[PDB]
Ligand binder design. Sequence first.
Ligand SMILES: [Mg+2]
Ligand SMILES: [Mg+2]
Ligand SMILES: [Mg+2]
Lengths: 245, 59, 85, 392, 217
Amino acid sequence: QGSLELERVMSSLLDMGFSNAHINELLSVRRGASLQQLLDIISEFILLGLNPEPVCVVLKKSPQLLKLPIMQMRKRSSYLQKLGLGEGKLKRVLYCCPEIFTMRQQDINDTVRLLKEKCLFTVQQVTKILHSCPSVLREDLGQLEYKFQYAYFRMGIKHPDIVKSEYLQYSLTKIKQRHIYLERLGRYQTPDKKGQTQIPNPLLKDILRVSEAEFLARTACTSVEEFQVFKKLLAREEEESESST
Amino acid sequence: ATVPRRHRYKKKWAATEPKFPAVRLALQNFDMTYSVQFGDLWPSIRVSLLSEQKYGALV
Amino acid sequence: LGQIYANNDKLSKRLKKVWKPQLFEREFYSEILDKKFTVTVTMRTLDLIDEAYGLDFYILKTPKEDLCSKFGMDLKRGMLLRLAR
Amino acid sequence: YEWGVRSTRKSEPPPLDRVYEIPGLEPITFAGKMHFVPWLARPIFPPWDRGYKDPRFYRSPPLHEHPLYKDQACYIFHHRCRLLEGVKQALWLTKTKLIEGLPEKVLSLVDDPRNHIENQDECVLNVISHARLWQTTEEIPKRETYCPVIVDNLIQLCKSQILKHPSLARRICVQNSTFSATWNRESLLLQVRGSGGARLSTKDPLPTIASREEIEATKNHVLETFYPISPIIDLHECNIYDVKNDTGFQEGYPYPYPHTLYLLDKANLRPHRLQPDQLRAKMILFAFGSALAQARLLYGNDAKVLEQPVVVQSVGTDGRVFHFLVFQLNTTDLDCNEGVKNLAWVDSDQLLYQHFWCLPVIKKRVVVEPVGPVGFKPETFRKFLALYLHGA
Amino acid sequence: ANFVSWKSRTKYTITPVKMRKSGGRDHTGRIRVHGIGGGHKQRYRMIDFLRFRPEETKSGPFEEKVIQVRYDPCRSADIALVAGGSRKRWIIATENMQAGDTILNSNHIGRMAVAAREGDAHPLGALPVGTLINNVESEPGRGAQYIRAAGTCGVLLRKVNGTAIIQLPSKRQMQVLETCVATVGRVSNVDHNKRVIGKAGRNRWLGKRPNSGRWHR
RNA sequence: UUAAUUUAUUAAUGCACCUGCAUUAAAAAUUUCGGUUGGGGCG
Ligand SMILES: [Mg+2]
Ligand SMILES: [Mg+2]
Ligand SMILES: [Mg+2]
């Protein structure tokens, strides 16, 4: 019965969409787990709009993902498909942070509730947030509401421009340095009760989207040494004000 | 309705004739005049004139 | 049916408050009436059975006010009239 | 999906008092004080049965304890059943064959010029104008009032050739008599219960039209089957029934034979009327029903093929359109779907007049349609004479 | 509490039953819903949404024909008379569903896909991998709750390991066991969204009432 | 209302529902709006 047990799973997986070797490449992954346990795992992935090619990318990265049991995973699958992450939108969630199916429900629910009500995003706006930046779920809850309202009040950019420009995937370490500096240059300026004073605010391509190597030539381009004091001057400004106030 | 926690002063800033503020009335009267005699050197000094002062020792 | 304060000190706003018992529904067996009952029961009644070492015991050991229930006091009539005859 | 919501269903009983769950004692209730008391125990009352029997408060037994709850389901036709497939459904459950148009012998009786009433074009127009314009005090009569007037006044015109034909005095037109007939088809039992108006009765048999070679010629014709409609649709399913054959009369009744059946659509509403496709289906069933009432009387309750067959015709109407049918009954072994079969000659959509303007129409002061019938067809009255003179 | 409802029949007939409209009120007489009340009178046709409802004695696959397809006042679709055997029904109609068309029911899951004609009722399991379904259940045996408005349809997408996810008109993929009966072929009244009602009186004939006059922020 | 005092009440979770204590919101409840220049070209 043990030899035939491999055959019927290989019969069902061949209809599912794998190859001869890629099924036999999954035999090195099953550490601890059984074969009946395996077939309920793989099906519940492919049922949520997964192709059989990206599914080995997450499982070879995360070999602990198979020990998750049967009944909690179907409740996890239903809550995420309520949120509209199914059919290929779950692929970018699974590769960058593989621990989604095992981490707890309430931290997903406290995150979506803070976005939907406290930040007043719409249902398609939360779904576009969750597809683009899945790093929002590993971030502390009080820090998430701060980085929205810093965009909402000090940066002033409205709801659709936060969601489209992938705003929530940058840290508060990075974003305080590149905002207050460009604010105090007289190159950025916050919008008014209606909007602005005289100058156009730059786009977030020129503010946030360039990396550390490409920052010094494209965004700053005034003096290389000039920002480095203000990297640490704002850091001391961060330290004393958090303790005293 | 979205309400702040800490950054309360940085919302609903008024335009010309702003009624309330004390310290940005010094700010808005520095934009025009120092843009004439300094050129593209007004951005360099404003970050220094709002961040922090370096002190010295008088032994 | 009583009243409280806000944050455990007198100088705050006064609020009303209803404390209710936690209601379990457990299944018991009466050795004297030989039927099982479906009964709304609390924590301290269950503890009052064990501290009396029996449920036929407890209905005959308490006066009226200690159980204070029309069904349980009918159980006191119903069980003890079984004993009377 | 269950029909009927909880708030409109029967209310559930209140949960029982816990006095009942102790077997030691008897409950203390308000059985003594003969009124409700909220602070006494809820009594159980015995099932109370009416000791006597009353006419205006009689309760029937349920439908498993009647004297005749036989397990085999019968299917009964009356004046209210409206068939789905129409004539094609009525053809199968009668086992009769459809021949379009009245036969040659019927239409030959009106061909002779002496067999015409005086002013056969004018006196019909006076019967139409009397019933639909001149009858009541009201301006316009509804269909529940002029429809019983047209045919029973047209009977009076067809009856006035009695001086010419003294055999016309052998007929009466009894109203409100109820016939019934039963037959079996492949398995199941089927019944007609003919409750209608104005059957016209003669004491002579009507002569057979189709020869026995024609009846032998009916073996080759197959009854046209239709599926997914079963041929039982829109008949009253009744599990409580008496298998009976009734001619509508007892023994020793003068005029024992029907001559023509005057069916009607007497409803004022078109949804409450019968369609012409459905009205001809009731023509098949009542004419077969009055004919099978005598096959079960004159020949007994045996399945055979009749040596001297019986023929009963019928006249159907709406008030504006007329339908004509002659039914020839010639077989009784109806359990088998093969062999010989009956034949009927029908007539579809045969209208007396197109429209009656009961009030003048005005279009810029000049009338375009005056009072009286519009589109009157005198040909239909010849056919309504030709059925009235058949066999006489 | 003098709101005994007109929903009181416990026995299915095809005949139009008189509907007692509410006007937005509930059983306490309070308004919960604003903007309905008045309109042309309507009668209710009890539409049978469990299309696989097995007849008496007989069971298994069995099969139906269409009598008439008339407009439903209490719906946004076009209902049809459908009679099988000695029972006649009220069902919702598909797009090319004329009077006298050939339709079928089944409850068998084959080892090969089943070709759909234009209007048949079948389980979701014995259907193509990308076919265009209609009225669907949610937990096998309930009836049709889901999509029936006018031309609203979805696709079966993928079927993995005894489960078929269907697609609602709103992109909200959901999990259905592959033995729920479902009508196949696009629902009638495909040009209901292209309707322009013209007057203000058309949606006061329909039953709707004007909105309030507070300017909200 | 972004005034003060509150969260009993509804809505969520915390150590299937219920119940007992907490957290975040929604709905609200209660109470007040000093004095001296009021038209000011807005301390
Ligand atoms: Mg409106
Ligand atoms: Mg408005
Ligand atoms: Mg004063």
